[PDB]
Amino acid sequence: MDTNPCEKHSCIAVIDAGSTGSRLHIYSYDTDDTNTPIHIEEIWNKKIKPGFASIQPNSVTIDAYLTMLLADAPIHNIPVYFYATAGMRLLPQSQQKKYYDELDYWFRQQSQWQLVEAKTITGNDEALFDWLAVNYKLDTLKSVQNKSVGVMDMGGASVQIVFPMPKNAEISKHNQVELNIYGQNINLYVHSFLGLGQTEMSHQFLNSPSCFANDYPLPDGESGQGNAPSCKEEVTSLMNSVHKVNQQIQPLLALNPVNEWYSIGGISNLASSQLFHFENSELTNQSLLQQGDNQICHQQWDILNGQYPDDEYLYQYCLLSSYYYALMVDGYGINPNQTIHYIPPEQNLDWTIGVVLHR
Amino acid sequence: NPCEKHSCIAVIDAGSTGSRLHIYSYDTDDTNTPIHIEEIWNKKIKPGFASIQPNSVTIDAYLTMLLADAPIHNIPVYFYATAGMRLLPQSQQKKYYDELDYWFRQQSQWQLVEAKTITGNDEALFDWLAVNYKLDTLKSVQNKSVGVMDMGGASVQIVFPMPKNAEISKHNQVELNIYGQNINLYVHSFLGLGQTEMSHQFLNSPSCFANDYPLPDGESGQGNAPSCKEEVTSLMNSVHKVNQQIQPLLALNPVNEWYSIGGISNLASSQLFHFENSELTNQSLLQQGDNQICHQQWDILNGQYPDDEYLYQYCLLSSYYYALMVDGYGINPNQTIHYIPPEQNLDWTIGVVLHRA
Numbered sequence: 043m044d045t046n047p048c049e050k051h052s053c054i055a056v057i058d059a060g061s062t063g064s065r066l067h068i069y070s071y072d073t074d075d076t077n078t079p080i081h082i083e084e085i086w087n088k089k090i091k092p093g094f095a096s097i098q099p100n101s102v103t104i105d106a107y108l109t110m111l112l113a114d115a116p117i118h119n120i121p122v123y124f125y126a127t128a129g130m131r132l133l134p135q136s137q138q139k140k141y142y143d144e145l146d147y148w149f150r151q152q153s154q155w156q157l158v159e160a161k162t163i164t165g166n167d168e169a170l171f172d173w174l175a176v177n178y179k180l181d182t183l184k185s186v187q188n189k190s191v192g193v194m195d196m197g198g199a200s201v202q203i204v205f206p207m208p209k210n211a212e213i214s215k216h217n218q219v220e221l222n223i224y225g226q227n228i229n230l231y232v233h234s235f236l237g238l239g240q241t242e243m244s245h246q247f248l249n250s251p252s253c254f255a256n257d258y259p260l261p262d263g264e265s266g267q268g269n270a271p272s273c274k275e276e277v278t279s280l281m282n283s284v285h286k287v288n289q290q291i292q293p294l295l296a297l298n299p300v301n302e303w304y305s306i307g308g309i310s311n312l313a314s315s316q317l318f319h320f321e322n323s324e325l326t327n328q329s330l331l332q333q334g335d336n337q338i339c340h341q342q343w344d345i346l347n348g349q350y351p352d353d354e355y356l357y358q359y360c361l362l363s364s365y366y367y368a369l370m371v372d373g374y375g376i377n378p379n380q381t382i383h384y385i386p387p388e389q390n391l392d393w394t395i396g397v398v399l400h401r
Numbered sequence: 402n403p404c405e406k407h408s409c410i411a412v413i414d415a416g417s418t419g420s421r422l423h424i425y426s427y428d429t430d431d432t433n434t435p436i437h438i439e440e441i442w443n444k445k446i447k448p449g450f451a452s453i454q455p456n457s458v459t460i461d462a463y464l465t466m467l468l469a470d471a472p473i474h475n476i477p478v479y480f481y482a483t484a485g486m487r488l489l490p491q492s493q494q495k496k497y498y499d500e501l502d503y504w505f506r507q508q509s510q511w512q513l514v515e516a517k518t519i520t521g522n523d524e525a526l527f528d529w530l531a532v533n534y535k536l537d538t539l540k541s542v543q544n545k546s547v548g549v550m551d552m553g554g555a556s557v558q559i560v561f562p563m564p565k566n567a568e569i570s571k572h573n574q575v576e577l578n579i580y581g582q583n584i585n586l587y588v589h590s591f592l593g594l595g596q597t598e599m600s601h602q603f604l605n606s607p608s609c610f611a612n613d614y615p616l617p618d619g620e621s622g623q624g625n626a627p628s629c630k631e632e633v634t635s636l637m638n639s640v641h642k643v644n645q646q647i648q649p650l651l652a653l654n655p656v657n658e659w660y661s662i663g664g665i666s667n668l669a670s671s672q673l674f675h676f677e678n679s680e681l682t683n684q685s686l687l688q689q690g691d692n693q694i695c696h697q698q699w700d701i702l703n704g705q706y707p708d709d710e711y712l713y714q715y716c717l718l719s720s721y722y723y724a725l726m727v728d729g730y731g732i733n734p735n736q737t738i739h740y741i742p743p744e745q746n747l748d749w750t751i752g753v754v755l756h757r758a
């Protein structure tokens with residue numbers, strides 16, 4: 043990297059306005075013979091909490107939020123894409139509109155940032171960007187591939203799944219995307235499940251004693267009595283009896299097998315805790331469930347809490363181990379012993395590189 | 402100045418969608434039990450306390466807006482939060498109460514007695530006491546069973562008379578003595594089954610929205626209240642097992658009269674629905690949601706009724722109340738459910754006046 047890379051390269055800002063927080067990335071890039079970006083490098087990032095959708099939208103709060111996100115960036119005179127995800131999708135269009143009317147007006151009132159788009163993207167667009175971002179990092183877009191790469195984004199309010207699949211005229215057009223990038227034609231299945239993100243999902247199980255460490259104080263006054271297999275079956279009832287995840291995904295995956303699975307999102311936070319024993323930044327669902335069951339569900343809450351003072355979301359780790367297995371194995375039909383790669387969390391990798399490539 | 406001649410306290414319902422301050426004046430009978438409760442002031446503010454960022458500046462702005470313009474002060478305050486705070490871990494709730502405690506210590510107008518998150522079962526007891534105080538049924542021994550439901554944003558409560566039972570958790574039973582009668586109640590709260598929390602599992606269900614309503618995933622609504630109700634029932638019973646927990650108990654301890662408070666009173670009194678005498682049946686609620694919202698064209702309907710911010714959810718909400726009351730609790734679809742007119746702003750706060758534990 044150069045000092046002041048944006049005097050030497052094209053630059054763009056992309057903001058992931060996620061359910062739990064917003065992340066500003068600034069990317070420098072060059073472009074190949076077709077004006078497609080290459081050599082993408084992240085030259086700045088800043089993450090703030092809470093989520094954009096969680097603020098009261100008037101001109102004071104919106105100014106304070108965008109100031110906190112944007113003011114100390116090292117360059118401002120570049121195009122901005124502000125793309126919100128599932129936290130904004132939980133709100134009706136009439137309510138979302140107040141947010142964007144205020145945001146638009148704030149960008150019109152300054153003379154540096156060049157707002158190109160500010161809008162809520164569908165879960166299907168979010169899954170397209172998930173797949174592009176990951177495969178860009180793996181260097182698999184340049185040439186046609188011997189192996190199928192699938193991507194899962196395990197977020198706070200929705201989850202996405204995306205994998206190669208030839209065009210199928212019996213599947214909704216909303217769940218399929220064709221793109222041509224770097225001279226290759228790629229066809230993907232995309233799907234997002236609103237409400238199955240970890241924050242939303244957890245609000246249906248807070249009083250389940252099987253989903254918390256022993257003696258954890260549940261909100262209703264009862265005590266935790268953890269057991270990950272029991273917790274996992276309760277979550278599977280939300281996955282399949284309510285959302286029909288298995289009926290939608292499994293017939294497609296069985297016919298379009300994925301050779302390598304990569305996950306991003308808040309799963310990498312869990313998988314990186316020292317309560318767990320994983321090598322090579324990968325896990326399997328069977329090991330996750332077994333280790334969550336032994337190291338968390340069946341331990342005494344007070345002991346655990348004193349022992350891991352740096353795990354802020356520690357109290358949910360029995361529930362999350364259970365949920366990820368319910369989602370991936372009972373929902374998507376992934377084999378419990380199949381390797382799932384996770385990107386280390388210090389990398390802060392989200393779907394934003396996909397916007398650089400796709401616009 | 403009523404607080405010079407009567408006992409006054411302030412009770413704050415810190416609900417998931419907002420906070421309500423009530424100031425009650427009362428006298429006491431010869432057991433020191435309150436009588437002649439009168440509400441002398443209320444103020445409702447939004448959003449919910451649990452939705453704000455807990456720091457000193459934001460907490461001061463919020464408590465100032467709730468309390469400052471009250472016509473009477475120098476009285477005891479009970480601040481009790483409900484399901485919005487229960488959705489957060491203790492570790493995170495503690496930040497709110499540390500800041501709130503500091504705010505009250507840094508002023509002189511209000512005497513803070515308690516500020517805490519109450520369980521859903523405490524909230525269900527208060528629900529029952531408030532409604533029965535209003536109906537005047539607490540004074541003497543009733544020959545009728547009165548059941549109360551509070552249909553909130555993040556949780557829902559159900560509570561009805563039930564003799565003390567060694568097989569049911571002690572957390573789900575309450576015994577109290579009031580006005581020299583002994584009363585035993587079953588109480589249950591379902592966290593996550595409030596209207597806001599439940600709705601986040603169904604926003605991409607076409608059956609739950611008017612025709613052509615733009616679902617967040619890009620598909621179109623295609624409303625059908627019976628199909629929506631069936632989807633909501635899988636959350637009620639396959640996930641939460643509401644039917645398994647409640648129906649055997651109501652079968653053995655039938656309720657003669659049902660009252661409902663909470664957000665359902667807003668839906669029943671809206672311009673889209675037609676009910677007389679402040680009561681409804683589940684059969685009529687589902688049918689009106691189906692015909693007046695579900696089976697309508699969204700653009701047309703939305704343009705007809707611009708003043709109802711909640712209109713778009715009415716197909717889902719009518720279907721959900723049916724799924725919860727009929728398929729969950731086992732209530733007959735033709736059974737009358739009384740609701741309190743929403744302009745009365747009745748919540749469970751009168752319960753705290755009557756019962757401080």
Ligand SMILES: O=c1ccn([C@@H]2O[C@H](COP(=O)(O)OP(=O)(O)NP(=O)(O)O)[C@@H](O)[C@H]2O)c(=O)[nH]1
Nearest residue numbers: 060061062127128197198199200307308387390
């Ligand atoms: O690799 C990562 C992924 C997530 N995180 C952090 O974990 C938290 C959860 O992010 P997330 O992927 O779990 O949820 P999200 O907010 O993007 N929610 P959604 O995608 O809108 O549903 C955030 O604080 C995020 O910055 C990392 O630190 N590193």
Ligand SMILES: O=c1ccn([C@@H]2O[C@H](COP(=O)(O)OP(=O)(O)NP(=O)(O)O)[C@@H](O)[C@H]2O)c(=O)[nH]1
Nearest residue numbers: 416417418419483484553554555556663664743
């Ligand atoms: O009778 C009523 C009941 C509720 N409301 C209002 O509807 C909104 C929803 O209140 P609610 O009872 O549905 O939910 P709540 O915020 O108490 N949520 P919870 O009880 O914490 O789960 C609030 O603005 C409330 O003041 C009335 O105006 N009148």
Ligand SMILES: [Cl-]
Nearest residue numbers: 261262520521
């Ligand atoms: Cl509770």
Ligand SMILES: [Cl-]
Nearest residue numbers: 165236617618
């Ligand atoms: Cl979506």
Ligand SMILES: [Mg+2]
Nearest residue numbers: 060127197198
């Ligand atoms: Mg995300």
Ligand SMILES: [Mg+2]
Nearest residue numbers: 416483553554
């Ligand atoms: Mg309430």
